[PDB]
Symmetry: none
Subunit: 172 residues, 2 copies
C-alpha cells in the first residue's frame, strides 16, 4: 500500500501536454484495492484513481513525508454543505461536500473556523455494492459504493465508472 | 521588495557579447506561483513578456520611470465586457499591402492598462495585447459565434510536451483564464513569450 505516502506522476489525456501532479495518498479502498483516494497539491477535490491501471497516469513515483462539526450542516465562506469526517493521513484536513456540488472536498476547516468562516448551524451498510442512477436520456450511470459516513451512516461515498471525483450521496 | 506591479520601467537588455538595447514597458503582473517572474507589456512589442527581471542577468540597470496614467472607466464598456471569452477574426495589414485575417480568442481585459485586452490566436498561441476597441471601430475585429472526467485548476503545475525533434519543452502553468477555465497561460523555460493553451482537453 502507498497509503500515507507521497506521489508524483504525469497526467496525460489526449495528445496533450503532460501536467505534473503531486499529492499524498490517503486511502486504498477495501472494496476495490486498485483504487486509491488522493489529495493533490492545488486541488480542492479528493481524487479516486486506479493509479496502476489508469493510462492517464504517467511514470508514477513515491516521495518523502473537530469532533464537534463532524456530521453537522454548515455554511462557510457563501456555500452550504456538510462536514463528513477528518481526512485520513492528513489529520488536520476535513472531508466536506456541498449541496450545490455533492462531491468530496478536503479543507483545513479549523483554520476557516478561526477566521470565523464557519457557521455550524433500514438497510445496513451498502459499501461494496454497485449502484445505478438513471439520468437525463434514459441511460444508466453506474458506480460503486466505497464508504459510509460514520457520523451520518445514511450518507455514502460513491466512485462512478466515468469520473475520478468521489460523489457523496444520501441513499435513504 | 519594491512593488513594481503597475509601474513604468526601463532596463538594458544584453544577450551574449551583443550590444545593450534599452527596453521600456509597463509591469502588468507578478506571478503568484513564481514571484520572481513578471509579465510586462513593452513599448514596441505586441506580445506580453514574462521575465524574472531581478534575477535574469540579461536585464541590467532596472529602473522605475515616472508613473503612467490609466483610464478609469473605458467607453463602450458593454462591448468590452461582451468581447471577453469570444472567438474572433482579427484583420491585420501585411507586406506592403492587403489584409491578413487571424482567428483567435479574446481572453480578458489586461491588468493595469485598462483600454487593452489579452488575446491569443489559433495560428500563434501566445499572449498578445491590443486596444481592441480601436480595431473593432475600424472594422478589423469581428466577433464570432462560439465534464465527465474533467479537472480542477492546473495553476502552479509543471508541464512538459514532446517537440518534433524528441526533446522536451518544460514549463509551468501560471494563470487560469477566468472567462474560459479550461484555458491556461504557460511560461515555458525556453521562451519569454506566454503561451495560451486549453488544458482540459
Amino acid at each position: 500500500n502507498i497509503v500515507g505516502c507521497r506521489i508524483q506522476h504525469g497526467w496525460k489525456e489526449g495528445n496533450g501536454p503532460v501536467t505534473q501532479w503531486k499529492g499524498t495518498v490517503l486511502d486504498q479502498v477495501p472494496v476495490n484495492p486498485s483504487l486509491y483516494l488522493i489529495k493533490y497539491d492545488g486541488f480542492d477535490c479528493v481524487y479516486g484513481l486506479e493509479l496502476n491501471k489508469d493510462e492517464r497516469v504517467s511514470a508514477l513515483e513515491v516521495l518523502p513525508d473537530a469532533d464537534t462539526m463532524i456530521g453537522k450542516a454548515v455554511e462557510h465562506m457563501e456555500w452550504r454543505g456538510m462536514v463528513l469526517a477528518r481526512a485520513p493521513v492528513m489529520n488536520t484536513w476535513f472531508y466536506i461536500t456541498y449541496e450545490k456540488d455533492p462531491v468530496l472536498y478536503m479543507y483545513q476547516l479549523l483554520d476557516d473556523y478561526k477566521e470565523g468562516d464557519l457557521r455550524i448551524m433500514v438497510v445496513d451498510s451498502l459499501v461494496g455494492k454497485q449502484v445505478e442512477y438513471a439520468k437525463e436520456d434514459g441511460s444508466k450511470r453506474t458506480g460503486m459504493v466505497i464508504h459510509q459516513v460514520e457520523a451520518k451512516p445514511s450518507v455514502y461515498f460513491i466512485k462512478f465508472d466515468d469520473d475520478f471525483h468521489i460523489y457523496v450521496y444520501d441513499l435513504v
